[PDB]
Amino acid sequence: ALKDPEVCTDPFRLTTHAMGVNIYKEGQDVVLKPDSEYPEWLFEMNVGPPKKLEELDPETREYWRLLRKHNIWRHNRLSKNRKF
Amino acid sequence: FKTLLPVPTFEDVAIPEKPKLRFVERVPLVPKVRRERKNLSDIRGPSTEATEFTEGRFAILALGGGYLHWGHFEMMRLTINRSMDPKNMFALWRVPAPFKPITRKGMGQRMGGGKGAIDHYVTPVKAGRLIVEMGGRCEFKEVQGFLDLVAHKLPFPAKAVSRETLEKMRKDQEERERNNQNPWTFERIATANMLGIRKVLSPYDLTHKGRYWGKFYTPERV
Amino acid sequence: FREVVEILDGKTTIIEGRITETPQESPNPPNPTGQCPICRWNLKHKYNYEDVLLLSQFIRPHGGMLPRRITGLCQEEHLKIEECVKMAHRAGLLPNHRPKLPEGFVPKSKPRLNRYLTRWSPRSVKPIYNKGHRWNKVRMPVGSPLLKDNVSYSGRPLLLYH
Amino acid sequence: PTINPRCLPPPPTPPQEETGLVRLLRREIAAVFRDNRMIAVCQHVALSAEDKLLLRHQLRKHKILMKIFPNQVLKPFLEESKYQNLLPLFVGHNLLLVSEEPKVKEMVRILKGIPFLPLLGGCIDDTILSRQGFINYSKLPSLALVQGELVGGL
Amino acid sequence: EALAGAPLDNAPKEYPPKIQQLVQDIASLTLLEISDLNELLKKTL
Amino acid sequence: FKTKGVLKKRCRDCYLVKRRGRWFIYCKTNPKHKQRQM
Amino acid sequence: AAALARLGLRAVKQVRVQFCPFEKNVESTRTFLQAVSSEKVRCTNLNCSVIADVRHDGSEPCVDVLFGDGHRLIMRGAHLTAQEMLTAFASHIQARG
Amino acid sequence: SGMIRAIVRAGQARPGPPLGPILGQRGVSINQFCKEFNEKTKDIKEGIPLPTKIFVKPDRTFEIKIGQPTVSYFLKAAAGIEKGARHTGKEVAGLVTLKHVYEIARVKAQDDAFALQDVPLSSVVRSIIGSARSLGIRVVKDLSSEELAAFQKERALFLAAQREADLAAQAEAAKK
RNA sequence: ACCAUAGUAGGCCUAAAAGCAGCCAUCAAUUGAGAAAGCGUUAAAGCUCAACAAAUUCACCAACAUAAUCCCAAAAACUAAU
Numbered sequence A: 001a002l003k004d005p006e007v008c009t010d011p012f013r014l015t016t017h018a019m020g021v022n023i024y025k026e027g028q029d030v031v032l033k034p035d036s037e038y039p040e041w042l043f044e045m046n047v048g049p050p051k052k053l054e055e056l057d058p059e060t061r062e063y064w065r066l067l068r069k070h071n072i073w074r075h076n077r078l079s080k081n082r083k084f
Numbered sequence B: 001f002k003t004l005l006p007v008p009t010f011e012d013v014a015i016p017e018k019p020k021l022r023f024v025e026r027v028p029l030v031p032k033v034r035r036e037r038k039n040l041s042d043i044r045g046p047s048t049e050a051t052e053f054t055e056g057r058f059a060i061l062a063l064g065g066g067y068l069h070w071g072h073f074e075m076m077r078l079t080i081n082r083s084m085d086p087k088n089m090f091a092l093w094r095v096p097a098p099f100k101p102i103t104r105k106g107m108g109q110r111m112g113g114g115k116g117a118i119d120h121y122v123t124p125v126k127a128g129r130l131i132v133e134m135g136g137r138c139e140f141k142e143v144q145g146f147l148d149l150v151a152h153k154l155p156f157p158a159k160a161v162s163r164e165t166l167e168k169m170r171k172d173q174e175e176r177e178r179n180n181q182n183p184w185t186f187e188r189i190a191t192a193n194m195l196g197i198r199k200v201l202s203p204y205d206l207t208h209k210g211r212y213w214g215k216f217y218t219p220e221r222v
Numbered sequence C: 001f002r003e004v005v006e007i008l009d010g011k012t013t014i015i016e017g018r019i020t021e022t023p024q025e026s027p028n029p030p031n032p033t034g035q036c037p038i039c040r041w042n043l044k045h046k047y048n049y050e051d052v053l054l055l056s057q058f059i060r061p062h063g064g065m066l067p068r069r070i071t072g073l074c075q076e077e078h079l080k081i082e083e084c085v086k087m088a089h090r091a092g093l094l095p096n097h098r099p100k101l102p103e104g105f106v107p108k109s110k111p112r113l114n115r116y117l118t119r120w121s122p123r124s125v126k127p128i129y130n131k132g133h134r135w136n137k138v139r140m141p142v143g144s145p146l147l148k149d150n151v152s153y154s155g156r157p158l159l160l161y162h
Numbered sequence D: 001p002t003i004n005p006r007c008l009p010p011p012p013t014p015p016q017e018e019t020g021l022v023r024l025l026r027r028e029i030a031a032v033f034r035d036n037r038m039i040a041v042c043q044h045v046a047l048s049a050e051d052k053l054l055l056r057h058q059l060r061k062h063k064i065l066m067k068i069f070p071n072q073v074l075k076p077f078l079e080e081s082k083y084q085n086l087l088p089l090f091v092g093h094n095l096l097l098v099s100e101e102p103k104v105k106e107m108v109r110i111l112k113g114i115p116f117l118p119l120l121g122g123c124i125d126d127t128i129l130s131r132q133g134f135i136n137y138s139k140l141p142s143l144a145l146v147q148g149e150l151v152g153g154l
Numbered sequence E: 001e002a003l004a005g006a007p008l009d010n011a012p013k014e015y016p017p018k019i020q021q022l023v024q025d026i027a028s029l030t031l032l033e034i035s036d037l038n039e040l041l042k043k044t045l
Numbered sequence F: 001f002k003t004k005g006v007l008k009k010r011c012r013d014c015y016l017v018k019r020r021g022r023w024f025i026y027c028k029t030n031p032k033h034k035q036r037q038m
Numbered sequence G: 001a002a003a004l005a006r007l008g009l010r011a012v013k014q015v016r017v018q019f020c021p022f023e024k025n026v027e028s029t030r031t032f033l034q035a036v037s038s039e040k041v042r043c044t045n046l047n048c049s050v051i052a053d054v055r056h057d058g059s060e061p062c063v064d065v066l067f068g069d070g071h072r073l074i075m076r077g078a079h080l081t082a083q084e085m086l087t088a089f090a091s092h093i094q095a096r097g
Numbered sequence H: 001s002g003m004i005r006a007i008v009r010a011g012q013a014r015p016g017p018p019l020g021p022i023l024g025q026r027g028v029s030i031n032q033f034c035k036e037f038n039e040k041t042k043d044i045k046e047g048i049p050l051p052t053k054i055f056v057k058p059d060r061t062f063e064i065k066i067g068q069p070t071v072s073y074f075l076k077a078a079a080g081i082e083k084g085a086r087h088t089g090k091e092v093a094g095l096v097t098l099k100h101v102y103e104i105a106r107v108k109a110q111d112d113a114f115a116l117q118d119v120p121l122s123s124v125v126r127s128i129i130g131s132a133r134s135l136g137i138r139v140v141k142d143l144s145s146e147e148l149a150a151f152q153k154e155r156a157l158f159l160a161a162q163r164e165a166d167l168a169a170q171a172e173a174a175k176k
Numbered sequence I: 001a002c003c004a005u006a007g008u009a010g011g012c013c014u015a016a017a018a019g020c021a022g023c024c025a026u027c028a029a030u031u032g033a034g035a036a037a038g039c040g041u042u043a044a045a046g047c048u049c050a051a052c053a054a055a056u057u058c059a060c061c062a063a064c065a066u067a068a069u070c071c072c073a074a075a076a077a078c079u080a081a082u
């Protein structure tokens, strides 16, 4: 019985307006501003797959951030033989 | 604060199709209608077949000798299949299906008459022969956990070993043999026939070097 | 050495620690390049349960033994010292290192049975009712295997099991 | 062996190599001690996760940030630096407060709002102060007011 | 180099020597230089 | 108790202790974990 | 800290800690302060005020407690260790309650 | 006495599951929630999920605070798809530009989870992208109407293939 | 020892699947913390373990019941041993 409200299917409006952003009944669709006015840092993030271990740099926290994550993965696998 | 040690990476390992252990038949397809003598030299002495890894990185090393029949194959197959991850682990048999017939004469009858009827089939295993070889993209610590359970239930004493561990116990059986501070060793006395000891020793003791007695293999004897 | 003093003065409790002067190590050891105290004074493989003057420097005032971290002994020697102290207490030596209990000394018991070189504890050994013949003989342990590396002037190995 | 190797003097000490993570913390400590004018030390206290996050938000209102550094890479760095006199404050658990354009009137008020968050000390513009010195510095006027009254006295 | 010893309020008696020498330097100037010093300070501050 | 050959900890609160010349597995939360070496 | 939470700190009225952080024999007092000021210990009586007095030349690291019965436990921790201070605090709670 | 994490449609608190057995177990009637929460928000469309925090007090009273909607509904509405991808990674559920993710960041920047930490704008957008990694929607640098339109037709054909395949699968299970 | 907070009931799935039937992915806030290592719940909640800091003796492994007329030399850890 509980379902999400109907969404827009017009390609022209979806590519120019984000329908899901406006959640107020009294609100309106926020018109797309030119991409030049957009900050340059939103066109710099890793859109594709996440960085591997080698693409990072040892003199950067990103390498240690990912290496910390890998240590937890290694410790979790070795703990599969817990009898407790 | 501690040290972030690097983690091993396993990306060059390819998992073959059907990684679980293959089913083994209770009796070979063509039965042996001729009953042969119970050779016991197939257990005595060191193994010459299947003493090295082929594809995997972990295996069960047979320290002693013994016979494996269809019951032990079921125990090895069922335990490994339900305890490993098929996506990351693949296992391979290192012993053939049971082929040597074992004879059991009827209950309660006088000696004589001849060899009885064929009861079951066994697989002879010597000392130092790998039984089940497993490989994959996982470390040895977790593979060792559920392999010692299988190795404990085998007839002959056995251990769960890997590529690095097996070489270390072979590189220490030579260092312990090179630095021995005892002038007299079984190899020197037996071969040279000192004290007329050949009357007590067996002709196979020249090759065994005193490390093998019957089907029992003591690795601490130099 | 530091001691703790607790005082009750009219519903007020005061707890303070006072430092007492501590005897220091002797100035000149025969082997200055040693690591642990035992082998620094050439006492390696040369002490036994009788050497009270040595075992009385690695024990607490109430019979306990100091931790290996404080003393600095190596693990191999620390276990040997621990074994000797246990054997010394059971042997009857070190009489001033027992705790004081005024209520318990009055009810005397059966007189103490003199003993020495007791490996186990008196309350944890069961009589050997079925000893056995010479081909399977239950031998009563004497001393500890940790002290089999001591120097033997006679040259005969020490008989630990008899 | 004639003499057990344990009793023999230890072998020459192998040279430990500092990794990237250790060297990363070395320059961050150097950076946070270089471009920042106010460095306030504090005794870190185990608080509620909601309360700890609330403290971060409140300090954000006055541009005050807080960072935590392990003593393994901080004590050797401060020993060789010009702030060696803060070493007694960095023996146990610790917390570091960082601010630009220092102003402790809005910082002490937050600290006094929680009675169990001690303010050990710190260095303000290459000058080491105690808690009382921080309190006196808090009641002290700003540069404009003090300098404006300086010409009045002269 | 090294930093200061962080004197306390229990026995606060030692003022910085840099202030003391500045007082002597200021006091070692004539009233004409007082006006010059004041005017420069007023212009800057 | 349960006279057993090899002692294993069934839960993380079991603590080994050697009394009367034998090792005993004593547990506080679950008394059923009490084991005794033979 | 975990020991104090299980023992019911609700019978403690007021705790104050006076120490000089710039001294050498105040490490023990710091550890005692962090244990009694932990989140678990705090959530036992929402009336108890923990005071962390900080001085420089006081030269007397001390801890003062007042129990519900009305006794005054004051221990000057300069040579005592953190374990000794906490254990004494724990012992008085059971007796005075 | 505790905290309750419940997602309720705007002004659609039903006197039943999942609100009934959960909120009523602590000792709070639903008719109280039929007036408080429903009147709490009246300018928000019903059917849009809203993660709400309920703090039940020892006197059986309660407090309600409303946060921003979930990321799942935002990106599904941004991509115009009714549900997420069944197999994430194998298939792409929806295609959106960087404007949708960036614009969502401001809406969620005022959420109590992110606003309290005063996270920068770059913090929120990465979380939305990370959420889209598991949601099946691929972020696109920039696209136009026809590029999006082509994806819709391809998605419909694959959806229709799975829609009818599921119908056959259910029939196979029942008959066998 | 000490210590636990973000998106977020991730998608799918199911009567309900909130780290914890299964499928799929395994990104991401914070100096710090795994779309989860274990327990638990109908589902949640909750406890614990990895990561913060603190801090630094050492810690792979080695446990196995009993017979019948009455146990069975006595006893002993150092005075010099090819």
Ligand code: FES
Pocket (backbone or CB within 6 Å): C034, C035, C036, C037, C038, C039, C040, C044, C073, C074, C077, D006, D007, D008
């Ligand atoms: S280190 Fe030489 S005897 Fe202890």
Ligand SMILES: [K+]
Pocket (backbone or CB within 6 Å): B151, B152, B153, B154, B155, B156, B157
């Ligand atoms: K066996």
Ligand SMILES: [K+]
Pocket (backbone or CB within 6 Å): I017
């Ligand atoms: K699940």
Ligand SMILES: [Mg+2]
Pocket (backbone or CB within 6 Å): A065, A069
């Ligand atoms: Mg991360």
Ligand SMILES: [Mg+2]
Pocket (backbone or CB within 6 Å): none
């Ligand atoms: Mg932990």
Ligand SMILES: [Mg+2]
Pocket (backbone or CB within 6 Å): I065
């Ligand atoms: Mg029995």
Ligand SMILES: [Mg+2]
Pocket (backbone or CB within 6 Å): I072
């Ligand atoms: Mg007799």
Ligand SMILES: [Zn+2]
Pocket (backbone or CB within 6 Å): F010, F011, F012, F013, F014, F027, F028, F029, F030, F033
């Ligand atoms: Zn237990």
